Amino acid sequence: QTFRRLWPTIAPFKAGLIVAGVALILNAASDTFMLSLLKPLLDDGFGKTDRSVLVWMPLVVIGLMILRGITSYVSSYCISWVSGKVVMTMRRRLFGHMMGMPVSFFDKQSTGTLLSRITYDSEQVASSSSGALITVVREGASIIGLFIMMFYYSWQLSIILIVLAPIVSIAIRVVSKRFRNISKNMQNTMGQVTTSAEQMLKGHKEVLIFGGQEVETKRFDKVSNRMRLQGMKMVSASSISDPIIQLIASLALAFVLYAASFPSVMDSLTAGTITVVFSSMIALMRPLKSLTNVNAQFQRGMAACQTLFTILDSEQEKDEGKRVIERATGDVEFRNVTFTYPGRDVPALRNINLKIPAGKTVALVGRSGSGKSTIASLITRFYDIDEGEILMDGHDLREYTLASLRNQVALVSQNVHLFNDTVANNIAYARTEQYSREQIEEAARMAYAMDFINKMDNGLDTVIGENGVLLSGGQRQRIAIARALLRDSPILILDEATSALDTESERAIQAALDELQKNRTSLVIAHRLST
Amino acid sequence: QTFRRLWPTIAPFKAGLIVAGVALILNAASDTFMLSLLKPLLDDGFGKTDRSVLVWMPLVVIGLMILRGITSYVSSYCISWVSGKVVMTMRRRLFGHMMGMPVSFFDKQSTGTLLSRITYDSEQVASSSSGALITVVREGASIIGLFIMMFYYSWQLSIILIVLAPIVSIAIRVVSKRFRNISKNMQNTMGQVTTSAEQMLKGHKEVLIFGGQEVETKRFDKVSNRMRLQGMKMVSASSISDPIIQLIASLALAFVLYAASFPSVMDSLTAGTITVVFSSMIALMRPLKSLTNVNAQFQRGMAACQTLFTILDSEQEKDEGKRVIERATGDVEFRNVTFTYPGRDVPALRNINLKIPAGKTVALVGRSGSGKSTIASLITRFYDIDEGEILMDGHDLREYTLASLRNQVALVSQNVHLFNDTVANNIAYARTEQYSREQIEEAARMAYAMDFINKMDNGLDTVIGENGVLLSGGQRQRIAIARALLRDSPILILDEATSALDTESERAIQAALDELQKNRTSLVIAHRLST
């Protein structure tokens, strides 16, 4: 089905994948050929007792197994080539659209969800498609090979087991249908289990506060019981298959035994031939078992890949070209501003008009049910313009190049995110260059955060391995302030945190922000008194 | 190893594993017996051209596959009985000690970590141990019965393949050590990539603000290529495992044929017997490859189970025995109980050996690194105070009513992570104690929560599936206030935030809090001067 979208993404790499099947084909050869040697092994090695000829066979078996080996080698190798490269380009395009996704994309999801999606589902698409081809190639090779074996051995028993093939196959199909139909809603209750445990863990505070230990343990117990029972159902149903499969498969073999009646009274063949027939039967039963599950589970894979596409096929940041905006100061203007993050709410700014002049910064307004803070993120256009008007120097909504804005605007927040690099370069993120560490050094002096860097390792170029989680929030605030210093961004957004900081930290931040509001209009949210 | 710890937890269910092993031995019996009846085929059905046995044996095969079926039935069944029961009790005691876990030791890890621990590690211990037993028992019975088959057919070729098998096992041991090292490396590398991807994702806001997206793409692609190569080498080695095994196995078969040529002198065996030997040998090659990595795999399960035990055997909530069921009020009298949940900076706060006045509530004070809410958490003692106890009214941490401390001292919070139950009983989380739903209505009246009942279904007994995420935080705080009303806590703690609420909401809330401040000393996180 939706392979019409993958095959192109794989098309440049087709050749190697192709190679796989070739070797995979030889697998059956080996299999068949190994089984083939049974005829001379038995019917000639002891029918004719060519004791000497028996020395030919072993070297063959060895070579054939070596063929199995090398074939498996290249199978795994090229299949993994494809698997990787596909996962590669896939996750690349993901990362892309993730970037292209406006932050709204995160309003309806969580990080962990996207981590899971990207990593797991990516790997699963490739693993699926791979095993699909792997097994499919074997089916196209083992089945027909053993068929030819029986053919050049007995047209008759061939005919029989062929007439039997539909029977066993449809049996497998229907029992697999039973299986999957039982596996519809299990995920629901399993996630219910996980989520019950989850909410209890999250709420341990309230839990202890009320000490509902007994009630919650009772809940937990019912949950565990449902877990036990549904797991029982799962494993039972799944297990029954092979019996049922082999059971009816039995009769097939038994019907092959029923060749006692018809062709054996005609002295059908020799013993070793029949040994080949039955060994071949069992061989079939390996990929026979495969085929159906192949179709099903790899349809599942392709469906996961369809989910992936939908994530990609989802619309990126809706930008018809925010044109070109030169870096500039100017003034911020609020003409008839109204905005609702979802439709769930009413206009956050209820038709509000404001003017924030050049360099004349503006602090956290004091109000009730404001939320302007997130509205600053909309001044950064992280979500969609809902209504109203936010103007920059006589220019309407989307004359505003996202890149140009994020350059010219700045954001300082209580929340700060760090990145496993040199914290200096983490500041330098504006192309990570064009700003000598010397300039970064003086910024740190202006950031007043070099004091912490003294405690930090790797000196002035502190490489924050695993981000150096020990780095306090206010340190990160000074970090972002230094970043702003490097960007000379005419527009700033600020925030005051109070987790654990010192008079030196807060007051040096005050001074820094003071210089920042100069020549560059700032937006602030603070808990101080006069400010 | 720690089976010394598991075997008791399973002992009430020995019979399960017992009948499991019985069935598994019967399964091996079925296998061996099919392979055996292979012989009389060639003995008479082609040697003497018999039909009698040529019809007998069909029915035999049928019944024997039915035995495979029923054996698999009870195997899966009882083994799952045990797996479940174990997981059940395991997760049970895991909740238990998990409730007796200090809040700090939560904050040592993350919630998701514990979710994974419980769910996965439980079911993984189960699956591991189960498959371990299944294998060891099947494998053993299969190998021994096949040995017997060869024995009553050829002392000689038996002897040979006996001498041979250890070599196979050693080759497998080597490849499994390769597995060990490549596996630890693979775990390291996949941890790396998931960390990088996530840490990039979370920063989307900042990533945009700096708009360095190309750099993120670069890092993404680097780690992607690293993953490509890592998985490449991983699957490479894991594949290469098989061919080496099958190759040396082939060499073994070759020696078997060298044998066939050496008693080619005597030529005692029958084509049947030959077929039996080789078929059985391939059989072996299934359980051998299994059992080796099985005896390896004990650890995996037992390793996770040891982690579990450590969680159990970790420091549960250590109280010298709190007791004190009776309720009252008295007053609060802290006795130097230290703060250093994460021992990083230094120990700082109030240090009062003093006492707190009755009736009068408690508000919020502003100081650097005050940590009031968590200082309140220690005031509530539900977080582990680092040192000492608390002689309240001359009565220690437990001499004053610790468990009842929850009843005596209320803990309202801004974020009320509620539970997937009836909002009515959500108020009665504390093991509903004949809090008449009439009292629920009247409290919601005293709380001014009756309006949110209209927002919900299920009459005045509103129920919230998935907590009814529709509910905004403010009315949940109001619910918790009503709960405090129900528990008639003379002492309380409250919480005021400013995420999103209305004027009338905050007003009626502060009215209800005054009522709570009335004749009940509380601790109130607030942004106002009402206190």
Author numbering:
A (entry chain A), B (entry chain B): 11 to 541
Structure paper excerpt:
Recently, our laboratory introduced the peptidisc as a novel type of peptide scaffold designed to keep membrane proteins stable in solution without detergent. When the peptidisc peptide is mixed with detergent-solubilized membrane protein and the detergent is removed, multiple copies of the peptide associate with the transmembrane domain, embedding the protein in a peptidisc, which can also incorporate lipids that may be bound to the membrane proteins. In addition, we show that peptidisc-stabilized membrane proteins (in this case reconstituted with the conventional ‘on-beads’ method) can be used for high-resolution structure determination by single-particle cryo-EM. Notably, the arrangements of the peptidisc peptides around MsbA and MscS are very different, revealing the structural basis for how the peptidisc scaffold can adapt to membrane proteins of different sizes, shapes and symmetries.
Using Escherichia coli MsbA, we show that peptidiscs stabilize this ABC transporter as effectively as MSP-based lipid nanodiscs. Image processing revealed subtle conformational variability in the distance between the two NBDs, as illustrated by the two final density maps at resolutions of 4.2 and 4.4 Å. The slight mobility of the NBDs in the nucleotide-free state is the likely reason for the somewhat limited resolution of our maps as well as the previously published cryo-EM map of MsbA in nanodiscs (also 4.2 Å). Like in the nanodisc-stabilized MsbA, our map showed clear density for LPS trapped in the transporter, which was not visible in any of the X-ray crystal structures of detergent-solubilized MsbA . In the case of MsbA, we identified a total of 15 and 21 helical segments in the maps of conformation 1 and 2, respectively. The differing number of segments identified in the two maps somewhat exaggerates the actual difference in the MsbA surface covered by peptides in the two maps, because longer segments in one map occasionally overlap with more than one shorter segment in the other map. For example, the longest helical segment in the map of conformation 1 overlaps with three shorter segments in the map of conformation 2. Overall, most of the helical segments overlap completely or at least partially between the two maps, as can be seen on the front face of the MsbA dimer. However, the side face of the MsbA dimer reveals differences between the surface coverage of the transmembrane domain by the peptidisc peptides, with the map of conformation 2 showing two helical segments that are not seen in the map of conformation 1 (red arrows). Most segments run almost parallel to the membrane plane, with tilt angles of less than ~15° for 8 and 14 segments for the maps of conformations 1 and 2, respectively.
